[PDB]
Structure formats: C-alpha cells, structure tokens
Amino acid sequence: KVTTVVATPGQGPDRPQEVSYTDTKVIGNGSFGVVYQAKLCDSGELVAIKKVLQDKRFKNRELQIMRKLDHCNIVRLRYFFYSSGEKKDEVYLNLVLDYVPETVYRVARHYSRAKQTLPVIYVKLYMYQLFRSLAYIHSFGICHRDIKPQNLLLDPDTAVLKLCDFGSAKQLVRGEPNVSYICSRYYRAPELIFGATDYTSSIDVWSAGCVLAELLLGQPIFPGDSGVDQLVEIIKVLGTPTREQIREMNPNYTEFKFPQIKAHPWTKVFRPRTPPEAIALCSRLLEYTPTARLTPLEACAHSFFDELRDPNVKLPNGRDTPALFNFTTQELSSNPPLATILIPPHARIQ
Numbered sequence: 001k002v003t004t005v006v007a008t009p010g011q012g013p014d015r016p017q018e019v020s021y022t023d024t025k026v027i028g029n030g031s032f033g034v035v036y037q038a039k040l041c042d043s044g045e046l047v048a049i050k051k052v053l054q055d056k057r058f059k060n061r062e063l064q065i066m067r068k069l070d071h072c073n074i075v076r077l078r079y080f081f082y083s084s085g086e087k088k089d090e091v092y093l094n095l096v097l098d099y100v101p102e103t104v105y106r107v108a109r110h111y112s113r114a115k116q117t118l119p120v121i122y123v124k125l126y127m128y129q130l131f132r133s134l135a136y137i138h139s140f141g142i143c144h145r146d147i148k149p150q151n152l153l154l155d156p157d158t159a160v161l162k163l164c165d166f167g168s169a170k171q172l173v174r175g176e177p178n179v180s181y182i183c184s185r186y187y188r189a190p191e192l193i194f195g196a197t198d199y200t201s202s203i204d205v206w207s208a209g210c211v212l213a214e215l216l217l218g219q220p221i222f223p224g225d226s227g228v229d230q231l232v233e234i235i236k237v238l239g240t241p242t243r244e245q246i247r248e249m250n251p252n253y254t255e256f257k258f259p260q261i262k263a264h265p266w267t268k269v270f271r272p273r274t275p276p277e278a279i280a281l282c283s284r285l286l287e288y289t290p291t292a293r294l295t296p297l298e299a300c301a302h303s304f305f306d307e308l309r310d311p312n313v314k315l316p317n318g319r320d321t322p323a324l325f326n327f328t329t330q331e332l333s334s335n336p337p338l339a340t341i342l343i344p345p346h347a348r349i350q
C-alpha cells in the first residue's frame with residue numbers, strides 16, 4: 001500500500017512535487033490532531049506527518065512560522081499538503097517533517113527509572129543545541145512558548161538535538177498583549193503563573209533552565225499540580241521575590257503575599273559532584289526578573305559549554321560532536337561580539 005500526494009516543499013519556491021510514502025503508523029494524538037510515521041518510497045527515509053484541522057478563516061500560524069525557519073537544531077518541514085477523506089467537508093493541513101527517533105523526555109526517563117543521571121557531556125550537547133535553536137527563532141522575534149523535554153528530539157548516535165512542535169509559537173511584538181495560558185506545567189515562567197500578558201521571549205529561557213536543572217536533578221525542579229504549588233517550589237529555591245521582582249514579572253500585582261523563605265543555596269539543590277558551572281548557569285537562567293535572565297546566545301557562550309569548544313572533544317562512542325560553531329549573522333545578531341567566544345580558534349583554522 002502506497003499514498004501519493006502533490007506537496008509543496010517547506011523551504012524554497014512553490015514547485016509542487018509528487019511525494020509517495022508507505023508503512024503509515026500512528027503516534028501523537030492530542031490537541032492539534034494526529035501524528036503518523038511513514039517511509040518515503042524512493043529514498044526509504046522516515047518522516048512524521050502532523051495532520052491538523054485547517055481553519056478556513058485564517059492561514060495556519062505554525063505553517064507560516066515553519067516555512068521561515070532553517071536551522072541545524074530545528075526539525076525541517078520537508079513538505080506540506082492539504083487533504084481529508086471521510087464524512088467531513090473539512091480541510092486538514094499535513095506537515096511532513098523529518099522523523100527523529102528519540103526525545104529528551106524518553107531518554108531522561110530511561111536514566112531516571114534506572115536511578116542514573118545522563119552523563120554531563122550529553123547534558124552539555126543537548127542544552128547548547130537548544131539555546132542555539134532559541135537564539136535563532138528569537139532573532140525573528142518568535143517565542144516557542146512551550147519548551148519542554150517532549151519537544152526536544154534527539155538522534156542518539158549523532159547527539160543532534162532538534163526543537164519541534166511550533167503549535168504554540170508566536171511573534172511577540174512590544175506593546176501587543178499575549179495569552180498567559182501557553183506553557184506546559186513545571187516549565188512555566190513565574191510571570192506566566194502570575195497571568196502576565198506582557199511577557200517576552202525570556203519565558204523560553206526560564207523553560208530551558210527548567211530542562212537543564214531536570215537533567216541534572218533526575219526529576220522536574222519546580223513540580224506541582226497547581227500554580228500555587230509550583231510557586232512554593234520556586235520560592236523554596238530562589239527565595240521569596242522582592243516587591244521589585246514581583247512588579248518586574250506581573251505588573252498587575254495579582255492580590256497576595258507568599259511565605260517569606262530565604263534562598264536555598266543552589267549548591268545544596270544538586271547532587272554533591274554536580275559541576276559548579278552547571279549550577280551557575282541554572283541560577284542565571286532561573287531568575288524572577290525576566291530581563292535579568294541570560295539571552296539564549298549568552299547561554300551558549302557560558303563557561304558550562306567550554307568543553308564543547310575544546311578541539312579534542314569527541315562523543316563517548318568515538319564519533320565527532322555535531323556542528324556547534326556554524327553560526328550565521330542572523331543567529332548572532334542578538335550580540336555579534338559574542339562570536340569571539342562562540343567560535344573557538346580551531347573553528348577559524350584555514
């Protein structure tokens with residue numbers, strides 16, 4: 001059995017191609033709709049097809065965003081096409097994406113179940129690549145707004161990480177308000193919990209920090225079934241936020257005061273032999289004041305990632321580390337001077 005569609009390439013000019021695929025499995029299910037796996041007939045390559053209801057009213061924002069993006073650490077939209085079948089008279093948008101086998105979520109949980117933590121080298125590789133993907137999208141003023149381990153795809157052999165699921169992503173424009181019900185629990189920045197609608201891209205940075213801490217800890221750092229419970233956990237670590245910090249997150253001073261707890265020394269939060277650089281980075285990501293958090297690009301240049309810039313660094317399995325230094329001017333525009341740290345001497349050899 002073989003499906004053949006006429007699809008538009010995600011990048012490049014509108015030059016429709018006849019695409020045929022087979023072995024259609026299922027995955028995903030949820031909010032958006034369905035995700036299938038498939039095998040492209042000629043090349044034999046695996047792809048994921050995300051199928052969602054097309055609005056008719058507006059054009060699909062995820063698609064609009066996907067087509068603008070091209071980066072080694074973001075899933076490639078290979079094709080998109082429309083279809084339906086069945087008793088519906090409703091259009092479905094189908095996004096054909098590179099299939100990447102693992103996710104940070106699944107990996108983390110394997111190590112967690114086995115009472116292990118992921119080797120710090122993998123923590124470095126995954127986090128660096130995430131920050132690059134954020135640096136890139138943020139440069140277009142696009143915030144992901146749902147950074148979490150399930151959205152971080154991994155090829156285990158190459159150590160390559162790819163940000164996915166742009167269903168929540170949106171261009172944040174100074175002055176325009178945005179819904180505060182967007183991020184997934186545990187990874188929500190305080191300003192989101194306080195219902196702020198004037199938030200910036202630094203919510204993604206907070207979320208990234210939550211992922212780092214979690215890979216280090218072996219479990220979510222700020223858990224809770226309610227916002228109340230999450231804030232308690234946040235306060236247990238960061239300490240009680242000052243009236244200044246409180247005004248910084250949500251201007252609209254919700255209505256209350258929290259228990260007055262002092263800052264738990266970040267060193268006492270983590271397993272005893274945790275690298276100090278890792279801990280330092282966390283504290284500079286997980287800050288109350290949104291403007292006080294490192295930028296993605298600033299994070300990449302943090303000393304916690306120095307090992308990745310070492311010329312002799314290899315994967316434990318012997319392979320080379322994947323591309324880490326092929327920055328574009330687009331990607332560096334945040335702060336071009338950082339190139340002198342980000343691009344190590346050996347990467348400039350001729």
Ligand SMILES: CN(C)S(=O)(=O)N1CC(c2nc(N)ncc2-c2ccc(F)cc2)C1
Nearest residue numbers: 027028035048097098099100101102103165
């Ligand atoms: C594409 N996203 C909307 S998603 O539904 O969250 N998507 C993450 C999952 C995904 N997407 C892509 N592109 N490749 C492999 C996988 C994947 C599916 C199942 C897995 F166990 C691991 C990875 C499915």
Ligand SMILES: [Cl-]
Nearest residue numbers: 014015016017
């Ligand atoms: Cl044509």
